[PDB]
Each structure stands twice: as C-alpha cells, then as structure tokens.
Design a binder for this molecule. Structure first.
Ligand SMILES: Nc1ncnc2c1ncn2[C@@H]1O[C@H](COP(=O)(O)OP(=O)(O)OP(=O)(O)O)[C@@H](O)[C@H]1O
Ligand SMILES: Nc1ncnc2c1ncn2[C@@H]1O[C@H](COP(=O)(O)OP(=O)(O)OP(=O)(O)O)[C@@H](O)[C@H]1O
Ligand SMILES: [Zn+2]
Ligand SMILES: [Zn+2]
Lengths: 160, 260, 169, 115
C-alpha cells in the first residue's frame, strides 16, 4: 500500500517519473540495467503516453465544441426557422431572405395565431382558423410550411 | 396616436399549407395578450431550440406554446402590480451588485484576514469605512448588504421567470433555483458563522461569464473518458509498484523532515 | 469500458510513427553523446549514493555516456545540461557548454518529444472525424438502397417508414 | 513579419478566455490556500537565503499563504506539494497531505493550466 502511494504521489507529480525519487544507482552494480529499464519504461508509459491522453481529450473536446457551435450558428443565421429553406434559394428574386424571415415566415406570428385559435370562441371560427384548430387538436404539424414558400412559387405563375 | 399606426401594430400575417397542399396567407389581428411577451424569453427560445430527427424545429416550438402562454399570463399579472414589476426589471442590476459585493468581501478577507464611475466610488467608500469603522464592521455591513441584495435578487428572479407557474415540484427541480438557494445559504452561513466561507461565493464567477463556462465544458462533456484514463494510470502505477516491491525494494528510500 | 479502449486507440493506430519518433530521439541522443564524449568528458560527473565516494564519472565509455544522457536528459525537463557540472564564467568552454545545453533542449526536448505528443492529438482528431462520419452515414442514409433522408422530404412516405417496412434489410 | 503576427493572433483573438481561465486558477488557488491555512499551516515552511535563520514560515497570514501557494505551486511542475515539508509515514495527517497534494496537482496543474 505504501509503495503504491509513494509511487503515485512522487511519480505522477515529478516530471522525470518514479526514477527521480529512487536512490541514484552505481555503475558497478548488478541491478543498474534493471533500474535503467524500469525508469525509462515508467517515463515512456505513464508520463508521456498516459498523462498526455488526459490532455489530448481536452483539446479534442475543444475542437468538437467549436465545430458544433459553428454549425449551430451557421444553421441559425442561414436557414429559416419555420420552413427550413436556405438563403441561396431566395437569391435573384423579388423578395430577399431578410423580408422572408421578418413578415412572411415570422415564427412569432405563428405563435400569435396559435394563441388566437386557443382564445377565440369556437362559434366565431373562420375557415382557416377552424382548419388550424382541428389540426392542433389532432396533434398533426403538417400545417406548418416545410421547404415551401409562396413567393418562390410565384414564378410558377408564368408556367401556369 | 395615429389611427392607422395602432391597427398596423396589432396585425400579423402567416402562411399555412392546407390539406389540399395549397398555400394560403392569413391576416389576423394580434391578440392584446400577445403584446406582453418578454424579449428575453424570445431570445432564449430562438437560440435554445434544437433540430429534431427530421431537421425541423417546429415540433419544439409548438410544444412550448402552452408554456409561453402561461408565461405571458403571469407577465400580465405581474404588470398589474407595479412594485413587483419594478423589482423584476432590475434583475441584472441586483445580480451585478451581488457579484461585486462578493468580490470585494473576498478581496478584503484575503488581504487582511486574520485581523484583530460607480466602481471607484464603491472602492473609496469601502476604504473610508475600513479606515473609520474598521475591517470587522466593514465586512459586517458588506455581508449584510450582500444578504439583502441576494434576497431581492431571488425575489426578482422568481417574479420575472415565473418558474412557479409550472408547479412547486418544477421550481424545486430547476437547477438555477437550487444554485441560488445554495448562494443564500452560503451567504447567511458565512455572515453568521465564519468569514472564510465567503470564498465559496467566488464560484459565482463561472455563472456570470459565458466564455469561462464554455471553457470549463471542455473538461466536462468527456469527463468519463478523463476519469477512465486516470483509472488506467492508477492500474499501471499499481503494477509498477508491485514490480518494484517484489524486486527493487531497497532503492525505495525517501527523505523526511521530522518536526520537533 | 468502450471509452477507455477508444482513448487507448489514439496511441495504437499510429504506434509505428511513435516508435520511429522515439528511434529518431535515440539517434539524436547518440550523436549528442558522441559529441560530449569527444570534447566534454570531464563535465559528465554524476552523484551516487553507495549502499553499506559520493561522486563518479559516467562518460568514460561511449555506451555509458549514451545511457546517462538518455536516462537523465530525456527525463529531466531541462535536458542533459542539468546533470552536467555547473560551469564557471572564467572558463574557456563556457560558450561551448551553453550552446550544447541550449541546442539539446531546443532539439530533443522541445521539438522531438513534442512530436510524440502531437501524433496522439492528431490521432484523436482523426478518430473523432471518422466516428462522426460513420454515425452520420448510419443515421442519415438507408442501409440497402443508400438513399439520403433529404430526398424523402415533402413526400407521402417519410424516411422512418422507408427504413422500417419498405427497405428493412 | 506577417507570420509572427499571425502566430501572436492565436493568443490575442481569444484573450478574454485566457484571462478568465487564469482568474479561475486564482480562485482555486485561493480556496486551496484557505484550506491549507486553516488545517495545514505548520507544513508551509520555506527556505530563504538572507543577504549579509535559513528557514521561515510563509502561511502565518492568509495573504502570504496565497502568494506562496500561487508563486511556488503554479511554477513548480509537481504543484504546491513540492514546497511543503516532506511528511512522515507515522503521522496522523499523512493521508490528508497526500490527498491535498494529489488533488491540487490533478485540478490546478493538469486540468486548469492545460485549459
Ligand atoms: N423564421 C425566422 N427565421 C429567422 N429569423 C427569424 C425568424 N423569425 C424571427 N426571426 C428573427 O428573430 C427576431 C425576432 O423578430 P422581431 O420582429 O420580433 O424583431 P424586433 O425588431 O425586436 O421587433 P419589432 O417588429 O417590434 O421591431 C428578429 O431577429 C427576426 O429577424
Ligand atoms: N435499411 C435500414 N436503414 C436504416 N435503419 C434500418 C434499416 N433496416 C433496419 N433499420 C433499423 O434497424 C433496427 C431494426 O429494426 P427492427 O424492425 O428489427 O426493430 P425492432 O423495433 O426491434 O423490431 P420489431 O418489429 O419486432 O418491433 C431498427 O432501428 C430499424 O430502424
Ligand atoms: Zn421560411
Ligand atoms: Zn432504402
């Protein structure tokens, strides 16, 4: 028990490993090669390859966190919250991505409509309001647009 | 005000897809309640929401609709009471004052213990109190001020966040409330039992700064790997100790300084 | 434990590079030992505790000088310079000792041993990237037909149904 | 030189994180100093060379104990444990010293300075 305690405490902390604390060997000794091998093996296994694996993990986690954060911000600042469309699809069009995410697909407006449906009396329900209320009751989320925008399809009028 | 402005403000438009796969634009009047939503909650929901398996964030946004509605209800009720609203509005001010007080008390304790703009002004006042009142009394007044500041901060926190709306079990479950009650317990315990306990309050720095927490997260996300690596090091040390003890036992000689 | 094995794999996938780097360090230590033995042999003085003199010379032979340099230079943070006798300002070889110690520290302790730890970090990054790519492919494409999830969007059947009934391997 | 400036930019773009990490290390050192002063105060013995005794105590006051711990613990590879007096096996506080030294090394020297 004490040998383990001494080795761990004075070998992990010391830069040179356990070899430093031990008595300095003599050249004319039978065990000198054994001491050399012991010290070198301990240094190359527990001080250069093991303790270094505790610091490599930190660097790897830093890289993973940075990549995850960059991906999240890119998605947040490039796509639309509701329909999930990308900014590039809106280029070279009458309406820009800035207008799309401010008036056309403002998620807060969707929240306001949900509150209105919950509050408004069933007798005063309109057509679209009734349809959204039924969808909400059914728990289906299909009424939320998904990769479709009326402005983009507006060019389809010429094709029609 | 301008008649057209008020109606313009309380009108919104959305786009929905019908069962026939056609898109329809709906223009509706914004409910009066909807005007009472908080900006902080909006930012938190916008940033915190995460994509689902399909890649759409709509599911979580819908699932949070009930909580958002309850939060706005509580916000309106709070707006009914002026005093509570005023207390809630200054949550950042209360937190900043509490953190500054904790830092100053810790600094004074470190510098003097044991003993027998706005920031420079506070520094001058603290120095004058130490010169006249003394280190002891000055620490006492600083601790009492921190106690009241933190209690007011807690009250403002519950009022603004309204975590009690979910339920008593929910509020107890929240980690932020547990951390704050830990802070109040530490503050009172230090003010009434021992001064050194204020040192614990320095951990609040991590909560104050986002970058520091992000840095700490590097050694927290993969903590299990670090612990397992340490266990591997312990196992290797154990084997090395066995090898040394069996063969090289005389060489394990250490120096010790015996006290008188 | 799987995580422990994954951590160990960092120093196992590129083990050959680590061994070759160690061999390079050994070669550099061998050259440094030759240079010291040829010129700076008196300065190689070591302290020894004899079990029941306290000083000895550890560079009489090339083999022992190599052993001493490697053991007490790779382990010590300051390199071989620490073990050697402390030089005097009014000495002819003082500049030589300074250059020797600094060169050893900047070559075998800052640029060589650091290449044995950089490999581990690089392997960690490679393993993480490979794992992330594999999980992404597994959880995004179909096992049999190899189609992607995005192609199934805005359709009657979702990707979940495709991989459960239509294309269940 | 442009390359030198680019290299320096690595420790300048995220300087705030580095300063905050240093502050965290200072806080941990402060707590460790408090723990040592309250319990392990006799072991804080340092060697001093007086210009024209050779031993002194550097934990009589909290400020000095903090200064000693930070200066001689952050710089030393083995942490604060190296400077403190070497304990004896037949001592009541030996387990406490072992835990103290190991915890300091594994928290402030392997996990904080590495950040
Ligand atoms: N679907 C969305 N996609 C991307 N960004 C969005 C989306 N919905 C809202 N946002 C952004 O979230 C924030 C909410 O917009 P909001 O209209 O509330 O802003 P505001 O300027 O504070 O309000 P006000 O209209 O009173 O001036 C804005 O940054 C808006 O660009
Ligand atoms: N071609 C495939 N592509 C992607 N995932 C697949 C594919 N085939 C099967 N899987 C997934 O592999 C697992 C095997 O599905 P399986 O039907 O055996 O699941 P189960 O729920 O355990 O079975 P049971 O039908 O008895 O409930 C499931 O996760 C299924 O989604
Ligand atoms: Zn959109
Ligand atoms: Zn398929």
């Amino acid at each position: 028990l004490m040998c383990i305690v001494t080795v761990m405490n004075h070998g992990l902390r010391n830069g040179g490993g356990v070899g430093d604390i031990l008595r300095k060997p003599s050249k004319d000794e039978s065990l000198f090669p054994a001491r050399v091998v012991y010290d070198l093996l301990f240094f190359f296994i527990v001080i250069i390859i093991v303790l270094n694996l505790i610091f490599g993990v930190i660097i790897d986690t830093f890289a993973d966190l940075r990549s995850e954060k960059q991906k999240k911000e890119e998605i947040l600042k490039t796509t639309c919250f509701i329909c999930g469309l990308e900014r590039d699809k809106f280029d070279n069009k009458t309406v820009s991505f800035e207008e799309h995410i401010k008036l056309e697909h403002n998620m807060w407006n969707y929240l306001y409509f949900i509150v209105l449906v919950r509050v408004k009396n069933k007798t005063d329900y309109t057509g679209p309001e009734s349809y959204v209320a039924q969808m909400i009751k059914n728990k289906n989320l299909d009424w939320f647009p998904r990769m479709r925008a009326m402005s983009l399809v507006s060019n389809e009028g010429e094709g029609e | 005000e301008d008649p057209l402005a008020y109606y313009e403000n309380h009108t919104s438009q959305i786009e929905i897809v019908r069962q026939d796969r056609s898109m329809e634009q709906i223009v509706f009047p914004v409910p009066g309640i909807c005007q009472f939503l908080t900006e902080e909650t909006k930012h938190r929901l916008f940033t915190t929401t995460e994509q689902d398996e399909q890649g759409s964030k709509v599911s979580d946004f819908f699932d949070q609709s009930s909580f958002l509605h309850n939060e706005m209800e509580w916000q309106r009720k709070l707006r009914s009471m002026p005093l509570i609203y005023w207390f809630s509005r200054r949550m950042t001010l209360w937190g900043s004052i509490s953190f500054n007080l904790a830092v100053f008390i810790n600094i004074i304790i470190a510098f003097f213990y044991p003993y027998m703009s706005i920031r420079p002004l506070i520094v001058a006042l603290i120095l004058r109190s130490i010169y006249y009142l003394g280190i002891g009394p000055t620490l006492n007044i600083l601790g009492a001020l921190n106690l009241t500041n933190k209690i007011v901060f807690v009250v403002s926190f519950v009022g603004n966040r309204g975590t009690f709306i979910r339920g008593y079990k929910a509020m107890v479950m929240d980690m932020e409330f547990l951390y704050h009650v830990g802070y109040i317990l530490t503050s009172v315990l230090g003010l009434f039992a021992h001064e050194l306990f204020y040192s614990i309050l320095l951990f609040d720095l991590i909560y104050r700064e986002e970058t520091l927490f992000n840095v700490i997260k590097s050694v927290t996300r993969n903590g299990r790997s670090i612990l397992l690596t340490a266990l591997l090091a312990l196992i290797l040390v154990y084997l090395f100790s066995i090898v040394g003890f069996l063969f090289l036992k005389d060489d394990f000689i250490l120096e010790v300084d015996r006290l008188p | 434990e799987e995580t422990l094995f994954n951590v160990i794999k960092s120093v196992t996938r590129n083990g050959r590079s680590i061994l070759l780097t160690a061999l390079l360090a050994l070669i550099l230590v061998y050259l440094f030992s030759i240079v010291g033995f040829l010129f700076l042999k008196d300065d190689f003085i070591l302290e020894v505790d004899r079990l029941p003199d306290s000083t000895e010379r550890a560079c009489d032979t090339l083999l022992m000088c190599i052993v001493t340099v490697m053991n007490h230079g790779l382990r010590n943070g300051g390199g071989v310079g620490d073990i050697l006798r402390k030089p005097s300002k009014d000495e002819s070889l003082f500049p030589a000792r300074v250059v020797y110690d600094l060169l050893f520290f900047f070559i075998v302790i800052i640029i060589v041993l650091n290449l044995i730890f950089g490999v581990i970090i690089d392997t960690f990054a490679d393993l993480r990237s490979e794992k992330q790519k594999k999980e992404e492919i597994l959880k995004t494409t179909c096992f049999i037909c190899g189609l992607e999830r995005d192609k199934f969007d805005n359709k009657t059947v979702s990707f979940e149904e495709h991989i459960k009934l239509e294309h269940n391997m």
